Each structure stands twice: as structure tokens, then as C-alpha cells.
């Protein structure tokens, strides 16, 4: 699943 360089 997505783990982006961005807050949840």
C-alpha cells in the first residue's frame, strides 16, 4: 500500500 513522502 502507499507509503508516500507526505503526512497521513
Amino acid at each position: 500500500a502507499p507509503a508516500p513522502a507526505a503526512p497521513a
Partner: antibody
Amino acid sequence: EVKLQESGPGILQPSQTLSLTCSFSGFSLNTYGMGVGWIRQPSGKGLEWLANIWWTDDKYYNSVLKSRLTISKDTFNNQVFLKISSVDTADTATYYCAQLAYHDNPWFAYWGQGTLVTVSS
Amino acid sequence: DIELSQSPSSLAVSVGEKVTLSCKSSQSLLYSNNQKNYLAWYQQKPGQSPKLLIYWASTRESGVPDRFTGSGSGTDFTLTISSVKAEDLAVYYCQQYYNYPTFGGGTKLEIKR
């Protein structure tokens, strides 16, 4: 309209700490869902992402370079900073800062002109 | 992280012609729980900063002409330029944001004249 200007040393010595400043208008890290990214490009090579900082002051680092990177913002939230410690010849590149995509989206919407950084004695 | 692989490395195309730029991902960029593809395309013209073309694999940034089309799903993506203009000379990069951003090595679009 969004504007970004990179500021950097032009030249620094091997082992010294690179210090880059991103100054921006037309948006703020006061506002929700706003952030700034750093991307670099050696001459005639491709793009490498370095680090992102958001309005939450959450910091996300390139896993390979993590231990050498520091990213921060000021209280006015108009300027973002990137440090790279112990620079070597391979850190010679053009360094861009970018507005991260509106409402918490980690692609690079608008890029600054970029400052060239040479690692040389 | 996730590795992006772009082909061909360099394209030589006449004005008016149609080109297809490929971006292969080492892991699927399709999230089942929103059915979005976490891919963006950029255009870098000589001398300039990269400029956003496509996000979510298929959505044009406003101002981007309709002849640039983003497509694909999972691990296989394409940027189609339907009638190449001379101004399209550039290196085109794909970038995933499913995990921490990574870029493909880029495709250099050259004009055959």
C-alpha cells in the same frame, strides 16, 4: 502566482556542509496541505529526490542519503533549508526546490530555476 | 525504494509524428483502495527546470495541450505525444510517489529534420 528561488554557495570544499535556501512567495507552509521538496541533477544526468518538509513540520528523507540530510523551515514559513554534510565530488549537481502538489500530494507542481553546486578545493 | 525504467533512452522523431514513451515500475503503483496510479510525468526543455505534465498517471496539469496523453496501470505506463512539435524537444521523466519519490532515467526526445 508561485515563485521559488534557490540560494547556494556556488562552490564549497570536499567534507564541508552544503547549505541551500529555498525562498518562495504565492504560497506558505502556514496553509494546510503545503510543502517543499528538493531534487538534484548532475550535468547531463537525471533527477534524484533528496527530501520533503510539510506544514506539519514532518520531514521525509532519501533513504540512501538520509544520515547526511537535514531539512527545516523558519517560523515565518516563507523559507525552507536543506543541509548535506561531508560533501564529495558526486554531490556536484544542480539543486532545485519545488512546491509539493496542493493538498498533501507528493509530486512536484512548480520548480525553482535551480542553483549549480561544485564540490572542489 | 521503487525503481522506474524508461524506454527508449532516446527518440528521434519528425515534426507531426506520434511517439510513445514507456515507464516500467519494479512495484505496482495501483492502490486497490482508491484505484489511482501514483505516477507523474515531467518535461525538461534544454536550459529549463522540469515542468509538470501528468499526475495520477492520466490527469493533465492545466495548460498542458491535449496531444500529451498519460496512460497505463500497475507497472506499465506510457506518455503519448500525438503530433510532435519542434518545441517538444526535451528530456521526459516519469516519477512514482507510491513510496518515497524516485524518477526514471528519462527519455531524450530529439527532432529529425
